Amino acid sequence: VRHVLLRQGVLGIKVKIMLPWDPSGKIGPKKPLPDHVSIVEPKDEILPTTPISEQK
Amino acid sequence: TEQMTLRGTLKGHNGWVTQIATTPQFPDMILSASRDKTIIMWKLTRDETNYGIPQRALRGHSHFVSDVVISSDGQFALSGSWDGTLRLWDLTTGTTTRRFVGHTKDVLSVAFSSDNRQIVSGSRDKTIKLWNTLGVCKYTVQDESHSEWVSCVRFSPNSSNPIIVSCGWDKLVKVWNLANCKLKTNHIGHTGYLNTVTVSPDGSLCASGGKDGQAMLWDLNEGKHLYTLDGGDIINALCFSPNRYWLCAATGPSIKIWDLEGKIIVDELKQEVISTSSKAEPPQCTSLAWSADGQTLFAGYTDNLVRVWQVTI
């Protein structure tokens, strides 16, 4: 918040800025997203199995 | 032919019976664990007033007690619990001998050796671990290990064989050799993830299972896929028999008791009907264990009961 003067009256400034970091980087900010808290889900799920024994 | 009659039913829990194990020193007792955070040591009778009454309930864990196992002596007892820790009981009144601190997450499986100096554990830490009976870590296995949770571990007869079984949710069965801690072998052959594994008392077999749907058999002596049977949609417990060469398979609605010589189903245990809507008539069977006699077996169900059956000739 900043007051700035002029010859006739005063003007009020307000500045609000939203920080970008959330999971990766800094790490600093915590996980909860703005106003819809979201889950991030990796992918993989397959099989290739058939009978075999690998003797070591 | 031989068939099964419904013997009776025990009552004492407020939660699902998770595992049962049997003292061979006393067939008079029998031990149980459950999802209401107690292990019940029973006092059995063969009476009709009851088939048994709970003697005591050992307490201390802050979560469910998954698995329980007897000592060779039968005067100690060991536990694995969903609190991430283990306890080592002095099976008389209570009074923990030792509590074992390790593992980041739960202790699913646990077992107690013949030599009574080696104790293993499967954990969602993704670690098999070896344990002194002073409750300190003889070794910890975390390299060449499963990349998914370790489901169940087993001790195998140490006739001359230094082998311990491991099975995870990574669709593999790893065999580990004592005091070298290397992979003896890796066995592949389960579409679904593996729940359990167990070894014959004679020591030549490994009955393994999972959500494969098929129950595949492996060889304890070098690792060979002996044979397979179609049955056991979800496999939760397996148990060889001492008085016969059977194998008893725990499916959810039913138990399938199989003779393997030759491969055939002996019987299917079905519980009597109860009218439900839409459908909630089966309670899941999750555990089973034979008695020393091998006439009677007990079963753990999720209706909070331990159902008894008996073989009749």
UniProtKB/Swiss-Prot annotation, chain A:
Residues 29-56 are annotated as: Disordered. Methylation by PRMT1 is required for import into the nucleolus and for ribosome assembly. Sumoylation by SUMO1 enhances protein stability through increased resistance to proteolysis. It is found in: Cytoplasm; Nucleus; Nucleus, Nucleolus; Mitochondrion inner membrane. There is a cross-link at residues 31, 43 (Glycyl lysine isopeptide (Lys-Gly) (interchain with G-Cter in ubiquitin)). It comes from the Eukaryota. The modification Phosphothreonine is found at residues 49-50. There is a cross-link at residue 43 (Glycyl lysine isopeptide (Lys-Gly) (interchain with G-Cter in SUMO2)). The modification Phosphoserine is found at residues 38, 53. Component of the 40S small ribosomal subunit. Identified in a IGF2BP1-dependent mRNP granule complex containing untranslated mRNAs. Interacts with HNRPD. Interacts with PRMT1; the interaction methylates RPS3. Interacts with SUMO1; the interaction sumoylates RPS3. Interacts with UBC9. Interacts with CDK1; the interaction phosphorylates RPS3. Interacts with PRKCD; the interaction phosphorylates RPS3. Interacts with PKB/AKT; the interaction phosphorylates RPS3. Belongs to the universal ribosomal protein uS3 family. Component of the small ribosomal subunit. The ribosome is a large ribonucleoprotein complex responsible for the synthesis of proteins in the cell. Has endonuclease activity and plays a role in repair of damaged DNA. Cleaves phosphodiester bonds of DNAs containing altered bases with broad specificity and cleaves supercoiled DNA more efficiently than relaxed DNA. Displays high binding affinity for 7,8-dihydro-8-oxoguanine (8-oxoG), a common DNA lesion caused by reactive oxygen species (ROS). Has also been shown to bind with similar affinity to intact and damaged DNA. This is Small ribosomal subunit protein uS3. It comes from Oryctolagus cuniculus (Rabbit). The gene is RPS3.
Swiss-Prot record, chain B:
GO terms for molecular function: ribosome binding; translation regulator activity. Phosphorylated on Tyr-227 and/or Tyr-245 by SRC. This is required for binding to SRC. PROSITE patterns: WD_REPEATS_1, WD_REPEATS_2, WD_REPEATS_REGION. GO terms for cellular component: dendrite; nucleus; perikaryon; perinuclear region of cytoplasm; phagocytic cup; ribonucleoprotein complex; ribosome. The modification Phosphotyrosine is found at residues 51, 227. It is found in: Cell membrane; Cytoplasm; Cytoplasm, Perinuclear region; Nucleus. Keywords: Acetylation, Apoptosis, Biological rhythms, Cell cycle, Cell membrane, Cell projection, Cytoplasm, Developmental protein, Gastrulation, Growth regulation, Host-virus interaction, Membrane, Nucleus, Phosphoprotein, Repeat, Ribonucleoprotein, Ribosomal protein, Translation regulation, WD repeat. It is a peripheral membrane protein. The modification N6-acetyllysine is found at residues 129, 182. WD repeats lie at residues 12-43, 60-90, 102-132, 145-177, 189-219, 230-259, 280-310. The 7 WD repeats mediate protein-protein interactions with binding partners. Monomer; also forms homodimers and homooligomers. Interacts with CPNE3. May interact with ABCB4. Component of the small (40S) ribosomal subunit. Interacts with the 80S ribosome. Binds NHERF1. Forms a ternary complex with TRIM63 and PRKCE. Interacts with HABP4, KRT1 and OTUB1. Interacts with SRC (via SH2 domain); the interaction is enhanced by tyrosine phosphorylation of RACK1. Recruited in a circadian manner into a nuclear complex which also includes BMAL1 and PRKCA. Interacts with AR. Interacts with IGF1R but not with INSR. Interacts with ADAM12. Belongs to the WD repeat G protein beta family. Ribosomal protein RACK1 subfamily. Scaffolding protein involved in the recruitment, assembly and/or regulation of a variety of signaling molecules. Interacts with a wide variety of proteins and plays a role in many cellular processes. Component of the 40S ribosomal subunit involved in translational repression. Involved in the initiation of the ribosome quality control (RQC), a pathway that takes place when a ribosome has stalled during translation, by promoting ubiquitination of a subset of 40S ribosomal subunits. Binds to and stabilizes activated protein kinase C (PKC), increasing PKC-mediated phosphorylation. This is Small ribosomal subunit protein RACK1. It comes from Oryctolagus cuniculus (Rabbit). The lineage of its organism: Eukaryota, Metazoa, Chordata, Craniata, Vertebrata.
